[PDB]
Amino acid sequence: MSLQHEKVTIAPLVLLSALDHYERTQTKENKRCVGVILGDANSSTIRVTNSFALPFEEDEKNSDVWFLDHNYIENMNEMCKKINAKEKLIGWYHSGPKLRASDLKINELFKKYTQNNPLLLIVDVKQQGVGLPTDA
Amino acid sequence: EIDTILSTLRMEADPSLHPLFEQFEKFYEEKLWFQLSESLTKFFDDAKSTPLRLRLYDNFVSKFYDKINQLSVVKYLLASLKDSKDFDESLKYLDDLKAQFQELDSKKQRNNGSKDHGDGILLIDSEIARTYLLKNDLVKARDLLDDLEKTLDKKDSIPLRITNSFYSTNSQYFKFKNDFNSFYYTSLLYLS
Amino acid sequence: MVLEATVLVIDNSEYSRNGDFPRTRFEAQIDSVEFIFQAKRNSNPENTVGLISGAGANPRVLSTFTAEFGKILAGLHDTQIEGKLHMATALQIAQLTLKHRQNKVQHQRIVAFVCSPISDSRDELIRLAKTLKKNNVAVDIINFGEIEQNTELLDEFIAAVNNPQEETSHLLTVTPGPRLLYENIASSPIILEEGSS
Amino acid sequence: EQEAHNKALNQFKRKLLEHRRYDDQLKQRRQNIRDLEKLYDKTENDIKALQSIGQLIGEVMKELSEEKYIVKASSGPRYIVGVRNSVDRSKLKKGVRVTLDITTLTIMRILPRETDPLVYNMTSFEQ
Amino acid sequence: IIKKYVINLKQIAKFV
Amino acid sequence: TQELQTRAKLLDNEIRIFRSELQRLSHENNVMLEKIKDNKEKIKNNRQLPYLVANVVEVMD
C-alpha cells in the first residue's frame, strides 16, 4: 500500500451526512452506524468528499457478531463513478466515540475493496470533545 | 515401498520411539493427513540426534509433500539439516524441493482456486545462505542474503516464521566475523 | 422446500484438504453446494441463497442472497484451509443474515457442513440453541466432522430444538469414510426435506 | 470387444475429446476477459474527462505581485487573477503561457510555450 | 451536405 | 491393463474440475459486459446532435 496519508481534509458535507444518517437509521443504544467514505486517495492530502450509510447491525451481547452488507458497497461503486469520477471507495466511518478492536476486523473487509490502508474516520456524533470532532 | 523403510528404522530405533512408527502408518491408511502431520513432527523434534532421520527423510517428505502443508515439509527439512554435518547432502536436497514446488503450483493454483507457494521458496533460500556459512564460504553467504532482503520487503504480508529464519542467518554471519557491535544491532531484529 | 431462504455455511479446514473423500473432501463439497442450490431454485424461483464461512475466528460473508449461481461459485473456489471452525459464531452471523428477506414470509434455514471436531463448549451451545428455537430458525446439520473420531455432541442440541414449529431441525449423518459426500446428498431427502411441523 | 474393460475405455474415447473442447473453451475465455478489461478502461476514460472540464489560456502579461497577477487572455479581455498554492511564484515569469480556471479565474498552472503555427512549422522539421 | 449537414450561421458558428 | 484403466478413472474426475472452472469464467464475462453497456449510453447522450464543430490547433501531448 501507499503510505501517503499525511493529512486527511474533511468536507463540512461529510460531517452533515454522517449525523443525519446516524439518526435516520435510528441506530441507538450504542448501535454503531458504519458507512462508506468516498473521495480521492493515494495522495498526500486525502480529500474526503462524501459518505453514505451502508446497512449495518451491531449486537450489544457480543461485539464479534455484526452484519455488514457486501453487495451494497458494490452497487454504490458504478453509481458513484458516474456522479463524480474523482471519487473512489477509500474506507469507512465509525460513529465512535470508542476505538474498538472490532475495527481491526471490519477494516479487513474494507481492505478487500481498497487500494490504500483503510481509512478510519471516527466522526464523533455526540460532539463531547468540541475540539477534535474527528480522529483519523 | 514405505513398508520396508518403516521396518528398517523401527528395528534400529529405540523402544521409546517404537510407537511413532506404528502411528505414521495408521493415519496414512485412514487418510487423516492432519494427523499425519502431528506424528511426523514429534519424530523430527526428538530424534534428530540419531541417524534414523537420515534413512527416513527424503523418501517420507518427497512422497508425503502434497498431503500436508508445504510449510510443514520445509519445517521438517530444517531439523534434518542442522544435525547433518554433510554439506554436499545439505546443498542438494534444497534444490530438489525447490523444483518440486515450482512444478506443483502449475496444478494447484487453479485446482484449489487458491493456493500460495511462496512460503517454501524464501525459506529454502535462507538455508542456502546458511549452508554456505558452515562451509566457510562467508563472502558468498552475505551477498545472497542482501538479495533476499530486497525480495522480502516487496512482499507486504509475510508469515513470522519466514522473517525469523532470515534474521537467524543474518545474525549468524555477524557473530562469525566477530563484529561485536554489529552482531548485537542485527541480532535485536531476530529477537523482536 | 418452497418460500425458503437458505444460508449455507462453508467450512474449510485441515480436514477439508484430506483425501477422506476422493480426490479430496474440499472438491467433493464443490459438487454439493451447487447441487443443493439448483434444486432450491427449481422448486421455487423466489428462493435465494447466500454463502458465509465458518472458517477463521472471524466468519466472512462471501456471498449475499442471490438467485444467480455465479456469485456463490466464485467465493467457493477461494479457500483458506488453515482457518478453524467456530460454529458458535457462524450460527449468529447466519441469524442476522437470514433476517434481511425480500419477503418475510420465507422460512429460515441454515444448512451447515461440518468438517472438523468442535472448538465450542457444550454449555455455550445449550444457551445458543434456545435462542434459535425462539426465533423459529431451524438448522440442518450435515455431519461428517465429529463422528470421524469423537462423540456426536451436536446431537443433543438438534433433539431439544425439535418441537412444533415453522420448520423442524434435522441431524443428517453422512458416514465419514470414503463414500462420496455429494453422492449421499443426492440420495438423501431433498424433496421430502421440507419444513415439517 | 469380448472384454468389457475395452468397452469402458471406448466410452472414455469420447470423454477424452470432451476435455479437449473444455480446455479450448477455457483459453478462449481467459483471452476474452482481458479484451473486455481494455475496452472497459477506454470507455471509463471518457467519464473521467467529463468531470475534468475545459480551461482558458492567457499569458502573464505583467507581474505586479506574488499575490496578484495580470494576465491577458488570448481570446480577449485582460483579467486580474490569483495564484494557486502548488504552482510556484518563480515558475511564473513574464511571457509564460498559463492556464487558469474558467469558473473562478485562478491560475492553475504553467503551460509550455504554445508557439504560433508559423514558428511551430520550422521546429517540426527533421531532415 | 454530408451523408446531417454542416450549417454555417451568420454569427460564423459551425454546427453539424 | 492396470495402468490404462487407472488412467480412465483419472479422466473421469478431470471433467469435474473442468466444469467447475468453466462456469466461473462464464458468469464473469456476462458481468463485465454489462458494465460496458452503461458507460456506452452516457457517451451516446453527448454524441447526440447538434454539437459544436471546432478545429484542433495542435496537440501538445
Side-chain angles (χ1 to χ4, degrees):
Chain A
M1 298 293 187
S2 180
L3 299 178
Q4 293 185 39
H5 291 291
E6 279 72 44
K7 284 177 82 197
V8 181
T9 62
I10 302 293
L13 189 59
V14 174
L15 323 180
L16 275 47
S17 296
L19 178 60
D20 179 62
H21 296 172
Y22 188 88
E23 297 298 338
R24 291 166 64 180
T25 48
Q26 295 290 343
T27 55
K28 61 184 166 57
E29 302 181 1
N30 301 300
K31 201 167 168 193
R32 298 318 178 184
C33 173
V34 169
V36 69
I37 306 169
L38 300 185
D40 77 18
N42 194 17
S43 289
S44 312
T45 285
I46 304 301
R47 181 67 69 185
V48 179
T49 61
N50 217 326
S51 55
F52 297 92
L54 299 166
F56 195 83
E57 305 291 337
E58 182 65 61
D59 184 345
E60 294 298 312
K61 182 177 179 179
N62 199 298
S63 68
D64 182 90
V65 170
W66 78 81
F67 197 51
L68 174 66
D69 174 334
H70 177 76
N71 192 53
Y72 193 105
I73 294 169
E74 294 181 45
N75 288 340
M76 286 297 291
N77 290 339
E78 296 298 292
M79 291 306 313
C80 71
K81 280 175 151 193
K82 291 175 183 177
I83 292 168
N84 183 319
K86 293 177 181 177
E87 298 181 304
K88 308 198 192 179
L89 186 151
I90 62 170
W92 62 286
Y93 68 95
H94 187 225
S95 66
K98 180 178 178 179
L99 180 57
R100 308 191 298 156
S102 297
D103 304 351
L104 292 172
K105 304 177 168 194
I106 295 171
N107 267 333
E108 193 55 82
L109 296 172
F110 280 105
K111 194 169 184 177
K112 181 175 180 177
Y113 285 104
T114 187
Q115 305 304 302
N116 70 340
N117 297 276
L119 175 65
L120 174 59
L121 182 63
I122 299 290
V123 181
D124 190 35
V125 299
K126 305 198 166 190
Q127 305 173 37
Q128 296 160 306
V130 197
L132 302 182
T134 49
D135 292 342
Chain B
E1 199 295 305
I2 65 171
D3 307 270
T4 44
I5 292 170
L6 190 73
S7 309
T8 314
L9 296 170
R10 183 179 178 79
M11 183 269 181
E12 288 179 292
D14 291 347
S16 305
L17 300 163
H18 295 188
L20 294 163
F21 287 107
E22 301 171 306
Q23 293 173 244
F24 306 146
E25 292 305 318
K26 288 186 290 295
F27 308 148
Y28 176 89
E29 293 168 347
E30 292 177 52
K31 299 281 188 279
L32 296 161
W33 299 342
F34 171 50
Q35 304 299 117
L36 188 52
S37 207
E38 308 189 17
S39 52
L40 288 166
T41 300
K42 190 156 293 307
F43 208 88
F44 284 123
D45 298 306
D46 296 290
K48 70 181 190 58
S49 67
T50 50
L52 306 171
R53 93 290 160 135
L54 179 166
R55 263 155 323 222
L56 180 69
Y57 43 37
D58 288 350
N59 300 113
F60 281 51
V61 313
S62 300
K63 195 274 179 186
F64 298 175
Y65 53 127
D66 57 84
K67 300 170 189 290
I68 63 171
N69 195 302
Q70 183 176 315
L71 182 67
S72 294
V73 171
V74 298
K75 191 58 78 169
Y76 303 165
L77 181 59
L78 222 168
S80 295
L81 295 179
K82 302 197 192 184
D83 291 87
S84 188
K85 302 299 182 182
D86 192 64
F87 302 120
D88 309 313
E89 281 187 313
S90 280
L91 198 63
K92 201 186 67 229
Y93 292 167
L94 290 171
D95 315 317
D96 294 342
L97 184 54
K98 179 195 284 292
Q100 192 180 50
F101 291 166
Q102 293 171 339
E103 291 170 348
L104 181 57
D105 66 14
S106 295
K107 181 176 181 178
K108 287 292 183 185
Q109 290 174 341
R110 274 293 179 175
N111 180 259
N112 310 152
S114 188
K115 192 55 163 65
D116 183 60
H117 293 274
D119 54 349
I121 293 167
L122 294 198
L123 276 163
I124 290 168
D125 289 346
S126 304
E127 296 306 309
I128 292 168
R130 182 187 56 73
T131 298
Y132 284 159
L133 296 177
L134 301 184
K135 198 168 178 175
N136 316 117
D137 190 359
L138 304 176
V139 180
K140 185 48 143 95
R142 184 67 265 187
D143 302 340
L144 294 172
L145 284 162
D146 283 314
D147 173 71
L148 205 152
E149 200 193 312
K150 313 178 160 68
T151 299
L152 187 72
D153 294 346
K154 288 181 211 170
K155 302 166 158 179
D156 312 308
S157 184
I158 60 172
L160 57 168
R161 299 315 161 112
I162 292 168
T163 175
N164 200 52
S165 67
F166 174 52
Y167 299 158
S168 191
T169 325
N170 295 348
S171 305
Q172 187 180 125
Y173 177 79
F174 290 107
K175 60 169 201 170
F176 282 0
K177 294 172 71 176
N178 310 109
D179 282 56
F180 289 102
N181 285 262
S182 296
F183 172 52
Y184 199 103
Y185 296 160
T186 301
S187 69
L188 282 174
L189 298 170
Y190 176 74
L191 293 175
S192 298
Chain C
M1 183 62 192
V2 301
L3 290 182
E4 174 189 352
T6 303
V7 153
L8 301 178
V9 179
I10 182 166
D11 182 4
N12 306 272
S13 70
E14 65 277 11
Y15 282 104
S16 305
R17 53 171 171 73
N18 290 349
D20 284 325
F21 289 119
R23 182 183 299 277
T24 55
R25 171 179 294 182
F26 180 47
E27 294 185 286
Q29 290 174 284
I30 295 298
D31 292 324
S32 63
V33 166
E34 292 173 356
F35 171 87
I36 293 168
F37 180 53
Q38 187 58 64
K40 295 294 184 184
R41 169 177 191 188
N42 294 328
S43 67
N44 187 22
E46 305 188 63
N47 283 8
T48 35
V49 167
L51 182 73
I52 64 171
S53 295
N58 201 256
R60 320 174 278 186
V61 174
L62 294 190
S63 304
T64 62
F65 279 122
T66 178
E68 190 182 359
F69 72 85
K71 189 161 178 154
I72 296 175
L73 180 60
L76 282 170
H77 291 165
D78 180 50
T79 189
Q80 303 292 319
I81 57 77
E82 297 181 359
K84 182 72 182 191
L85 181 61
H86 281 85
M87 182 52 82
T89 57
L91 289 164
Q92 301 299 109
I93 298 274
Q95 187 159 239
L96 290 172
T97 301
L98 270 157
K99 188 173 272 295
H100 306 288
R101 282 173 290 170
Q102 322 86 63
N103 294 287
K104 301 303 193 290
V105 179
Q106 301 186 280
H107 309 178
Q108 308 196 67
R109 176 60 64 78
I110 301 175
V111 179
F113 301 119
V114 183
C115 306
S116 58
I118 62 172
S119 61
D120 296 344
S121 200
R122 179 192 171 162
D123 191 40
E124 186 71 78
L125 295 172
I126 293 169
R127 297 180 267 217
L128 282 160
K130 298 171 181 177
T131 306
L132 316 172
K133 68 180 191 170
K134 178 192 299 290
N135 302 296
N136 292 91
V137 180
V139 66
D140 287 7
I141 305 300
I142 300 170
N143 198 249
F144 53 86
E146 286 195 295
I147 54 194
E148 297 178 64
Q149 62 176 240
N150 301 117
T151 38
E152 188 174 48
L153 293 168
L154 307 174
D155 187 62
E156 293 168 316
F157 314 124
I158 293 299
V161 165
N162 287 123
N163 80 305
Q165 289 190 114
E166 180 170 62
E167 298 205 310
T168 51
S169 68
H170 295 80
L171 186 54
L172 288 156
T173 299
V174 178
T175 52
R179 218 206 60 79
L180 301 167
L181 181 53
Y182 67 88
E183 183 166 62
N184 191 286
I185 297 300
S187 301
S188 287
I190 194 66
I191 63 171
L192 301 177
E193 200 201 61
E194 292 184 282
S196 296
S197 194
Chain D
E1 299 304 310
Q2 201 46 77
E3 285 81 50
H5 77 46
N6 183 59
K7 292 291 176 171
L9 293 170
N10 304 134
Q11 251 182 104
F12 274 91
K13 185 176 179 182
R14 310 288 304 187
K15 297 168 163 182
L16 197 54
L17 301 162
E18 265 284 284
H19 302 306
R20 291 176 183 179
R21 299 301 68 210
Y22 282 134
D23 182 35
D24 301 326
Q25 281 180 112
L26 291 173
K27 295 150 73 200
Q28 251 180 267
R29 288 296 148 201
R30 291 186 188 102
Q31 201 77 263
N32 299 337
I33 292 168
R34 288 193 292 272
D35 289 345
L36 292 188
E37 203 296 303
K38 290 176 291 195
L39 205 63
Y40 186 52
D41 182 73
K42 279 199 177 291
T43 58
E44 173 70 70
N45 280 336
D46 189 66
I47 293 169
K48 280 170 182 175
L50 277 179
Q51 301 299 331
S52 205
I53 301 299
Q55 290 166 1
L56 185 54
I57 50 187
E59 182 184 284
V60 176
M61 182 178 176
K62 180 169 168 197
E63 175 187 346
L64 173 69
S65 196
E66 287 161 58
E67 306 184 282
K68 294 187 190 179
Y69 291 63
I70 299 170
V71 294
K72 180 178 179 181
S74 293
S75 302
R78 290 174 289 161
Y79 304 131
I80 300 171
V81 299
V83 274
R84 180 173 67 94
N85 288 337
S86 294
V87 61
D88 177 83
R89 299 289 75 75
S90 58
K91 288 181 179 180
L92 301 175
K93 51 177 181 292
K94 192 169 165 181
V96 80
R97 296 292 171 87
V98 288
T99 198
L100 49 93
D101 296 348
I102 293 169
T103 299
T104 50
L105 299 176
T106 304
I107 297 170
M108 176 175 275
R109 43 196 281 274
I110 61 170
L111 302 179
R113 190 186 301 274
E114 317 172 86
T115 179
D116 288 348
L118 189 151
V119 166
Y120 194 48
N121 296 332
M122 298 302 101
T123 302
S124 72
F125 290 109
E126 177 178 352
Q127 305 183 349
Chain E
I1 295 156
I2 317 189
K3 198 170 141 72
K4 261 154 206 161
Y5 315 94
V6 179
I7 47 164
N8 183 12
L9 301 179
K10 293 176 173 175
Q11 40 189 54
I12 301 299
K14 272 170 61 163
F15 292 97
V16 177
Chain F
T1 68
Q2 198 75 4
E3 294 171 64
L4 179 58
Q5 281 174 239
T6 50
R7 178 174 178 188
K9 295 175 175 59
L10 181 54
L11 289 186
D12 199 86
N13 193 244
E14 280 167 6
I15 293 169
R16 174 180 64 199
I17 293 169
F18 272 133
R19 284 181 175 131
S20 300
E21 292 186 281
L22 186 53
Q23 289 167 235
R24 180 172 39 173
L25 302 162
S26 278
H27 70 59
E28 291 171 347
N29 284 283
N30 300 299
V31 170
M32 173 53 54
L33 182 59
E34 293 302 321
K35 292 180 179 181
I36 314 177
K37 308 189 185 180
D38 315 308
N39 292 17
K40 193 68 73 175
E41 291 300 325
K42 188 179 192 183
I43 292 169
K44 184 184 184 167
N45 303 321
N46 298 79
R47 279 172 174 172
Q48 171 66 54
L49 291 170
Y51 53 86
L52 171 68
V53 175
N55 67 62
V56 179
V57 174
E58 66 181 6
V59 289
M60 293 167 71
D61 296 337

Short mmCIF file of all heavy atoms in Angstrom, two decimals, chain C residues 10 20 26 46 52 65-66 98 109 158 169 173-174 193:
data_model
loop_
_atom_site.label_atom_id
_atom_site.label_comp_id
_atom_site.label_asym_id
_atom_site.label_seq_id
_atom_site.Cartn_x
_atom_site.Cartn_y
_atom_site.Cartn_z
N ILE C 10 -20.07 -22.73 4.84
CA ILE C 10 -18.98 -23.46 4.22
C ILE C 10 -17.88 -23.41 5.14
O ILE C 10 -17.48 -22.41 5.71
CB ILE C 10 -18.52 -22.94 2.85
CG1 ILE C 10 -17.41 -23.89 2.36
CG2 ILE C 10 -18.00 -21.51 2.92
CD1 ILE C 10 -17.05 -23.76 0.91
N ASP C 20 -10.13 -37.70 2.58
CA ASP C 20 -11.10 -38.51 3.33
C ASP C 20 -12.18 -38.99 2.35
O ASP C 20 -12.60 -40.12 2.45
CB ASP C 20 -11.92 -37.69 4.36
CG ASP C 20 -11.10 -37.33 5.63
OD1 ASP C 20 -10.28 -38.23 5.98
OD2 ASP C 20 -11.19 -36.23 6.22
N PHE C 26 -12.62 -31.33 -0.07
CA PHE C 26 -12.93 -29.99 -0.46
C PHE C 26 -13.61 -29.92 -1.80
O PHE C 26 -14.56 -29.19 -1.96
CB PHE C 26 -11.66 -29.12 -0.52
CG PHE C 26 -11.84 -27.64 -0.94
CD1 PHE C 26 -12.86 -26.80 -0.39
CD2 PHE C 26 -11.03 -27.06 -1.95
CE1 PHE C 26 -13.06 -25.49 -0.89
CE2 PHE C 26 -11.24 -25.83 -2.53
CZ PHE C 26 -12.25 -25.01 -1.93
N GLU C 46 -38.22 -17.78 -6.46
CA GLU C 46 -38.05 -16.73 -5.45
C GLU C 46 -37.04 -17.13 -4.42
O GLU C 46 -36.51 -16.23 -3.81
CB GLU C 46 -39.32 -16.27 -4.67
CG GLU C 46 -40.56 -15.81 -5.47
CD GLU C 46 -41.52 -15.27 -4.43
OE1 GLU C 46 -41.12 -14.26 -3.79
OE2 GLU C 46 -42.67 -15.76 -4.24
N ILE C 52 -21.76 -18.08 3.64
CA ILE C 52 -20.87 -17.47 4.60
C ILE C 52 -19.85 -18.52 5.05
O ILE C 52 -20.09 -19.68 4.79
CB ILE C 52 -21.60 -16.90 5.83
CG1 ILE C 52 -22.28 -18.03 6.61
CG2 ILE C 52 -22.64 -15.87 5.41
CD1 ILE C 52 -22.85 -17.58 7.95
N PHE C 65 -27.60 -13.05 -0.53
CA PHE C 65 -28.72 -13.65 -1.18
C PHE C 65 -28.71 -13.34 -2.71
O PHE C 65 -28.55 -12.20 -3.17
CB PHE C 65 -30.06 -13.12 -0.70
CG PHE C 65 -30.47 -13.81 0.63
CD1 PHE C 65 -30.72 -13.03 1.76
CD2 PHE C 65 -30.42 -15.21 0.72
CE1 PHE C 65 -30.89 -13.65 2.99
CE2 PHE C 65 -30.53 -15.82 1.99
CZ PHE C 65 -30.76 -15.02 3.14
N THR C 66 -28.89 -14.44 -3.45
CA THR C 66 -28.76 -14.31 -4.88
C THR C 66 -29.51 -15.45 -5.45
O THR C 66 -29.71 -16.44 -4.74
CB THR C 66 -27.28 -14.29 -5.27
OG1 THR C 66 -26.98 -14.21 -6.66
CG2 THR C 66 -26.53 -15.54 -4.72
N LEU C 98 -30.21 -13.96 7.85
CA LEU C 98 -31.44 -14.55 7.43
C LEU C 98 -32.54 -13.50 7.71
O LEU C 98 -33.61 -13.66 7.16
CB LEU C 98 -31.87 -15.90 8.24
CG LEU C 98 -31.31 -17.09 7.55
CD1 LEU C 98 -31.22 -18.24 8.55
CD2 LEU C 98 -32.01 -17.43 6.24
N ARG C 109 -33.67 -21.20 7.19
CA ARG C 109 -32.93 -22.48 7.17
C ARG C 109 -31.49 -22.26 7.17
O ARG C 109 -31.04 -21.36 6.50
CB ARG C 109 -33.30 -23.33 6.05
CG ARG C 109 -32.54 -24.67 5.81
CD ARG C 109 -32.64 -25.64 6.95
NE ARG C 109 -34.07 -26.08 7.16
CZ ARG C 109 -34.82 -26.96 6.48
NH1 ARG C 109 -34.36 -27.49 5.32
NH2 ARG C 109 -36.08 -27.30 6.82
N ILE C 158 -29.74 -30.65 18.62
CA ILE C 158 -30.76 -30.82 17.49
C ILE C 158 -32.05 -31.35 18.03
O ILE C 158 -33.06 -30.89 17.63
CB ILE C 158 -30.24 -31.76 16.39
CG1 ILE C 158 -29.07 -31.09 15.71
CG2 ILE C 158 -31.36 -32.05 15.39
CD1 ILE C 158 -29.47 -29.78 15.08
N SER C 169 -35.72 -28.99 12.93
CA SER C 169 -34.28 -29.30 12.93
C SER C 169 -34.04 -30.70 12.46
O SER C 169 -34.71 -31.63 12.89
CB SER C 169 -33.67 -29.03 14.38
OG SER C 169 -34.16 -29.95 15.34
N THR C 173 -26.60 -37.70 9.08
CA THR C 173 -25.31 -38.25 9.29
C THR C 173 -24.94 -38.79 7.96
O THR C 173 -25.64 -39.59 7.42
CB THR C 173 -25.46 -39.38 10.34
OG1 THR C 173 -25.96 -38.89 11.55
CG2 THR C 173 -24.06 -40.02 10.53
N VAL C 174 -23.73 -38.41 7.49
CA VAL C 174 -23.06 -38.91 6.25
C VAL C 174 -21.88 -39.59 6.90
O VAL C 174 -21.16 -38.99 7.68
CB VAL C 174 -22.60 -37.79 5.32
CG1 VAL C 174 -21.89 -38.50 4.14
CG2 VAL C 174 -23.75 -36.92 4.84
N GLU C 193 -37.34 -33.19 2.26
CA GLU C 193 -36.68 -32.40 3.22
C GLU C 193 -37.48 -31.18 3.10
O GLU C 193 -37.17 -30.45 2.16
CB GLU C 193 -35.16 -32.22 2.87
CG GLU C 193 -34.40 -31.80 4.12
CD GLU C 193 -33.06 -31.13 3.67
OE1 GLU C 193 -33.20 -30.08 2.98
OE2 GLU C 193 -31.95 -31.64 4.02
#
